[PDB]
């Protein structure tokens, strides 16, 4: 029998995959224990469908991000701070970075997503990964300068 799986089963089939097994195994084991479903027509479309949405949203974000990147990638985040020479007095944080991109360039963001373990303390020209969507990183150059 062709069936639809609800939980991946070792050396058998991946979740959502469609396999063909002995009817005894399918109806006295896999269907009872909510472990799979008849590869019918009725609840066969419902599988053909959720793949679309789950493929639609992911495909949506992986584009609502690429849409972002292009926004960045073609600009620079300048941060004025008080400091003498290359070492800063205070510090520039992601939450700081946020204010800027929010302040200038009218963009909103999540600092937690941004890659920056240690809060910046010296000036210079920095490129930092925001990581809004995995496999879809961003390179945002931030010019931290004083005065």
């Amino acid at each position: 029998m062709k069936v639809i799986l609800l939980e991946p089963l070792e050396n058998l089939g991946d979740v959502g995959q469609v396999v063909d097994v002995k009817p005894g195994y399918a109806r006295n084991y896999l269907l009872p224990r909510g472990l799979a479903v008849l590869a019918t027509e009725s609840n066969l479309k419902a599988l053909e469908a959720r793949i679309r949405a789950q493929a639609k949203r992911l495909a949506e974000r992986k584009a609502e991000a690429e849409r972002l990147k292009e926004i960045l990638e073609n600009l620079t985040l300048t941060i004025p701070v008080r400091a003498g020479e290359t070492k800063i007095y205070g510090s520039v944080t992601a939450k700081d970075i946020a204010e800027a991109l929010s302040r200038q360039h009218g963009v909103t963001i999540d600092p937690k997503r941004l890659a920056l373990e240690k809060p910046i303390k010296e000036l210079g020209e920095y490129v930092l990964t925001y990581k809004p969507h995995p496999e879809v990183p961003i390179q945002l150059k931030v010019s931290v300068v004083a005065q």
């Binding site: 009817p23 109806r27 269907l31 009872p32 008849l38 019918t40 009725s42 609840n43």
Partner: protein
């Protein structure tokens, strides 16, 4: 030895025929009937315990339409069925046939 609850099958009556000798096609005189006696042929009925609406439903259905039971089940999802009792969920399914 009864009635399929899904196919309406039922014990029919068949004859038990006893034949002897060589057929013609085998280059023989021909077959000869030595004794005809009524038998009766049963549908291969079996049990089909299923749980529906948190309730166990079991059919005495023939082995042929077994895959129809689950169909009924699968088809019964779109029904107010909680709160009911066994005989109630059976009759509600059968109405789908």
């Amino acid at each position: 030895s009864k009635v399929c609850e899904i196919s309406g099958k039922r014990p029919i009556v068949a004859n038990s025929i006893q034949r002897r000798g060589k057929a013609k096609r085998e280059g023989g005189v021909g077959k000869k009937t030595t004794g005809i006696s009524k038998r009766r042929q049963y549908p291969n009925l079996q049990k089909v315990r299923v749980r529906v609406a948190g309730q166990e439903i079991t059919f005495r259905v023939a082995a042929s339409h077994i895959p129809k039971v689950y169909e009924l089940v699968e088809r019964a999802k779109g029904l107010k069925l909680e709160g009911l009792s066994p005989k109630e969920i059976k009759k509600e399914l059968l109405k789908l046939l």
